[PDB]
Structure 1
Amino acid sequence: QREKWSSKIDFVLSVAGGFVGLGNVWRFPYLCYKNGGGAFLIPYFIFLFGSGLPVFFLEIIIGQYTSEGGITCWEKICPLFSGIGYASVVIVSLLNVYYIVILAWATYYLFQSFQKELPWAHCNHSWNTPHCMEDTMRKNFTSPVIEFWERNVLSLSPGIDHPGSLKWDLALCLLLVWLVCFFCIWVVYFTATFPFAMLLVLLVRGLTLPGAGAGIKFYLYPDITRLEDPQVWIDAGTQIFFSYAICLGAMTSLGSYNKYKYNSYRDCMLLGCLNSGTSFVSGFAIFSILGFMAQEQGVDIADVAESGPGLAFIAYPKAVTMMPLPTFWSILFFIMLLLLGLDSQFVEVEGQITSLVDLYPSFLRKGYRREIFIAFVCSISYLLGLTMVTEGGMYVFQLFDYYAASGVCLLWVAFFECFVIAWIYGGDNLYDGIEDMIGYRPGPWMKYSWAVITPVLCVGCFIFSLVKYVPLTYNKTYVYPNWAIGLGWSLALSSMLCVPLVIVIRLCQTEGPFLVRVKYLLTPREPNR
């Protein structure tokens, strides 16, 4: 009863709104700034042209061919490695806990931009320390925008071990965003066209700012020696795997609604180009604004703002005040951020819910219990994400961002998605199905990226990150305690360990000698419906 899309344009809009969002506008610039300015692009492009697009198209084609969600598609592909799908769900679940938290911040900012003057424009407020000095007079001191971000929006604690108290105002914004998400799940043209126009306006403002040449050179000129550190490689690879919403099961679920005779190859390539171009262009605006900040504050470009998940809330609000009538542009920018995040959250939550109901179609999608299940999932996610709303919750958010739905947890899955398809299931066998679906035999790029490039990249990044291990730090100053790093590793393992547990369970349930069990569990039941 897999209801196909009403039209191809519906699928295109759905995926386009799904995989563009806070990854392109918020996470990519923050990861690029955290690592080297230009050294982040080389691994980014290598993963994009070697693993990102191939894995994205692989997930889309698996969904379209099996006509099944994230979890149940692997049952038709390779029953033994079904746990990958489960792992994917776990990953997306963790993402749904913290991704929406970002929107809460934006929502708070959206409520702080209805004043006569922007709170972060000038110093001398109730939340401003005596060190806080106006940036124009910065000829020690802290920028008022950073002061507003840290002491008013966050009210940051000394560490993760001091959770402080629930803010009661970021919590309200998070509740509002979750209510919006639940009532949407329970115009797309405007919601997709407006963010690009606002991003173009921001790009023009950043480019015309004085001192932006230094920021652009910082963003574009790589540092070769930085590539000797595995952290930039793994960060760029996982940013590629996160910005495309792969290893989550959302892409497989979205593609499962496609018609069997549908040329997913061309659309997928065009959409991947669109997403990569959006990220690359937004980086130009962010780093030109950062270069202007460096010029006006008399400080290095690497010390202007926060290296953590706050660059988008420090650079863009700064550039807003430069535009005439800054209240209007602040409202527009935060509405754009809300739209992008809400679209991404809608797509991811819908994918998770449809995978879960595919897992138990008798009850979870009977018709009456689907709404109850969606409400329960939303409530559980809100209660879980309340741990990042507290004063010390930024450190928990950083732990979630670095370990959950990112890092080796993706590299673990992207390998097993490819190794099963490329070597166990068969590259040529899937190419025959893709020829039957899209009508023409594709080039060897997908086959030689699944077979060699992607598993090699994943295993090399994993091994080189483990060999030269650097503990996670917040804003390159805070040293997490041992238990915090252990909690982050537990978050990663919660999804990493689904693959072998399911293999063990399958080997124990199937009867007979070991060889017969393995042979029967490696046989695809039906590749196509």
Structure 2
Amino acid sequence: VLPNPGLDARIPSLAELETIEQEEASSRPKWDNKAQYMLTCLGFCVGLGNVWRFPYLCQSHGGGAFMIPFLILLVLEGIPLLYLEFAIGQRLRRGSLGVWSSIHPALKGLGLASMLTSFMVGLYYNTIISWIMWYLFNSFQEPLPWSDCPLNENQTGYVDECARSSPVDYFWYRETLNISTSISDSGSIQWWMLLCLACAWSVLYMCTIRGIETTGKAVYITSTLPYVVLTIFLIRGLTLKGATNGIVFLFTPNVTELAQPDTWLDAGAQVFFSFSLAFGGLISFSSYNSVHNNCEKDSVIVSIINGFTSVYVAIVVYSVIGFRATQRYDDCFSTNILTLINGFDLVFQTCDINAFLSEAVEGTGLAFIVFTEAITKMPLSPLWSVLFFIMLFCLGLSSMFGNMEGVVVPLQDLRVIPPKWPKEVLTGLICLGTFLIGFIFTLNSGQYWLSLLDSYAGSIPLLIIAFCEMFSVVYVYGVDRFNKDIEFMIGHKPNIFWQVTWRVVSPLLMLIIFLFFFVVEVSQELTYSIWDPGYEEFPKSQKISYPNWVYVVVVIVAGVPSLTIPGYAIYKLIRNH
């Protein structure tokens, strides 16, 4: 509907697609088998971002008061984008930067904002993978290192921190992070963390060395192991002890918080992190399929698995949450019994079970504090620790293949490295570059920096890219051409569910969410949680205000990608003059 002259020149002819699959055998990559593509989509729409984020947000709002908005916006904003990205990639036979640049030359900004976003989410998730590997490397020890405290110079006093806190809390904050008392206290580089980061990047490079030539074989183990091990943990979880108590707790949501715009905003932004939408990897990956590939059926199958896996992982977390709360209730109970037995042959504790289940975990605690403590209480605790960190490591890796795709393909399409040089060279330099940037999260104050990416700074860009993709495919390229295109690829025009969601519903929902993501989220003061053993009520939570200069970080990490979209468009409409 917007005037777009010259479109037919830039994009492949519909008749040219019938004479491209058997003559572009070289120059362009091909999936060996549809299984390889489906296993790659599984790993990118159900890696971390689904399995890591969803469960945290469940327990940070409400067990079931968050799944409702999540599953509504999965259907009405996620399935439509997922289909759109799959189809547009399959038709225009290019990556994100090739696709938006060919729909209109002023939209090369859309593709640069996806490459930067993909860069930033890869930098975040590979630090989480370096932590996961630290814990996997300490999981080959009969007494898991986080099960016991250290000691004093007298070798008769437990470390006061550990004592005032827990071996788990102390192994996370002191033995792993060696955390400082604020973001201003940088300290220095934790060498043992640096070794784990190098390991994460180096494994990723081994799997992504020749893009889909190598990542397509990696996914046979990396997108299949996580799901079997998560099945083993579902069965272990349900038979834990108080597990059924926890699972009743996420299926009795308070509805008073289903009316909280934050629950809707987090669910909004979770739909794009869950599916890895607006990163651009999905467009590149769908561009290597046959032009007659059924992208509608693929988007639906991926979606159904995404929603089902979201709810499944919430069951595995809450069974373990329920187990922890019940062993506290009991413990606390058994000490209130022991106070009057020690007094009568009188201090007491108030500990109902609903006060323990509804005790939120800040940061990455669900993985390195709750699941780690509960694995030590299980028999063969070292075999459950290794399975848990191997599951998470493979999920991380599967997700990292998509995020790497979304940085490598655009840099190939910007022709910035000599074409002569093998891709292996380009992949390697991205791994080295991002490895060096990730030294900031190896500092004494690293977690604090990683928690800034957990702010709205990590989300605004994703909401802006997704909207612009939808808008540009429907109004700049034209939904009518797009329907004739799909009808050519799969044999039938997309039905009225797709027409309503693309033209009105999805764009309008995205707009509302972006608008009210500033009316509340951005307007609120950015605060974070510090671990300082010199704090009154020490093992308790002291949230403080970030310094002013961190605004100079959120302002770029989010702004730049977002502003790349118009910024490049305005550059292109003043070079024309």
Partner of 1:462: 514
Summarize deviations over 1:249-297 as a string: whole Å, max 9, x none: 1110111111111111112211221122222111111112112211222
Alpha-carbon contact 2:40-2:223 (below 8 Å) kept: no
Partner of 2:120: 94
Alpha-carbon contact 1:128-1:144 (below 8 Å) kept: no
**Equivalent position to 1:295, from 326, 330, 333:** 326
Alpha-carbon contact 1:212-1:287 (below 8 Å) kept: yes
**Equivalent position to 1:490, from 556, 571, 576:** 556
2:165 corresponds to 1:142: yes
Alpha-carbon contact 1:3-1:257 (below 8 Å) kept: yes
Alignment partner of 1:25: what SS? coil
Deviation at residue 304 of structure 1 after TM alignment:
4.6
Q: For the residues of structure 2 that align with 1:431 and 1:350, how far apart are their CA atoms?
A: 27
Partner of 1:420: 472
2:453 corresponds to 1:453: no
**Equivalent position to 2:484, from 432, 442, 461:** 432
Deviation at residue 79 of structure 1 after TM alignment:
2.6
Q: For the residues of structure 2 that align with 1:192 and 1:217, how far apart are their CA atoms?
A: 30
Q: Which amino acid counterpart does residue 262 of structure 2 have in structure 1?
A: Q
Partner of 1:107: 133
Q: Which amino acid counterpart does residue 358 of structure 1 have in structure 2?
A: D
Alignment partner of 1:474: what SS? strand
2:448 corresponds to 1:395: yes
Partner of 2:376: 321
Deviation at residue 336 of structure 1 after TM alignment:
1.6
**Equivalent position to 2:89, from 53, 63, 69:** 63
CA distance 1:498–1:111, shift in 2 (3 Å): same
Aligned pairs (5 A) from 1:357-368 = 357-360=412-415, 364=417, 366-368=419-421
Deviation at residue 57 of structure 1 after TM alignment:
1.4
2:72 corresponds to 1:6: no
Aligned residues: 501
Alpha-carbon contact 1:26-1:309 (below 8 Å) kept: no
Partner of 2:363: 308
Larger Rg: 2
Alpha-carbon contact 1:55-1:418 (below 8 Å) kept: yes
**Equivalent position to 2:291, from 251, 260, 266:** 260
Alignment partner of 2:52: what SS? helix
Partner of 2:493: 441
2:194 corresponds to 1:171: yes
Partner of 2:402: 347
Summarize deviations over 1:130-174 as a string: whole Å, max 9, x none: 3646xxxxxxx5343233222222222222111222111111100
Compare 179-188 and 46-55 and name the one that shifted more: 179-188
Output the TM-score relative to the length of structure 1. 0.89
Partner of 1:20: 46
Q: For the residues of structure 2 that align with 1:401 and 1:114, how far apart are their CA atoms?
A: 31
Partner of 1:521: none
CA distance 1:175–1:336, shift in 2 (3 Å): same
2:78 corresponds to 1:52: yes
**Equivalent position to 2:426, from 351, 359, 373:** 373
Q: For the residues of structure 1 that align with 2:197 and 2:316, how far apart are their CA atoms?
A: 28
Q: Which amino acid counterpart does residue 191 of structure 2 have in structure 1?
A: W
Summarize deviations over 1:337-357 as a string: whole Å, max 9, x none: 111111211232133202220
Partner of 1:504: 570
Q: Structure 1: where are the runs of 5+ without partners?
A: 134-140, 512-529
Q: For the residues of structure 1 that align with 2:54 and 2:141, how far apart are their CA atoms?
A: 30
Q: Structure 2: where are the runs of 5+ without partners?
A: 1-26, 210-217, 330-350, 530-540
Partner of 2:142: 116
Query: Percent sequence identity over matched residues?
Result: 38
Alpha-carbon contact 1:399-1:488 (below 8 Å) kept: yes
Q: For the residues of structure 2 that align with 1:128 and 1:497, how far apart are their CA atoms?
A: 53
Partner of 1:74: 100
Q: Which amino acid counterpart does residue 554 of structure 2 have in structure 1?
A: G
Q: For the residues of structure 2 that align with 1:228 and 1:472, how far apart are their CA atoms?
A: 23
Deviation at residue 502 of structure 1 after TM alignment:
1.2
Deviation at residue 20 of structure 1 after TM alignment:
2.2
CA distance 1:225–1:464, shift in 2 (3 Å): farther
Q: For the residues of structure 2 that align with 1:462 and 1:25, how far apart are their CA atoms?
A: 24
CA distance 1:112–1:278, shift in 2 (3 Å): same
Deviation at residue 125 of structure 1 after TM alignment:
5.5
Partner of 1:38: 64
Partner of 1:180: 203
CA distance 1:276–1:296, shift in 2 (3 Å): same
CA distance 1:317–1:125, shift in 2 (3 Å): farther
Q: Aligned-residue CA RMSD in angstroms? A: 2.2
Partner of 2:435: 382
CA distance 1:391–1:306, shift in 2 (3 Å): farther
Alpha-carbon contact 2:134-2:196 (below 8 Å) kept: yes
Q: 4+ residue stretches of structure 1 with deviation over 6 A?
A: none
Q: For the residues of structure 2 that align with 1:366 and 1:465, how far apart are their CA atoms?
A: 42
Partner of 2:8: none
Summarize deviations over 1:166-218 as a string: whole Å, max 9, x none: 11111110011111112222264333322111101111222222222332233
Partner of 2:9: none
Summarize deviations over 1:388-413 as a string: whole Å, max 9, x none: 12121101101123345x32211111
Alpha-carbon contact 2:79-2:300 (below 8 Å) kept: yes
Alpha-carbon contact 2:77-2:501 (below 8 Å) kept: yes
Q: For the residues of structure 2 that align with 1:451 and 1:307, how far apart are their CA atoms?
A: 39
2:527 corresponds to 1:473: yes
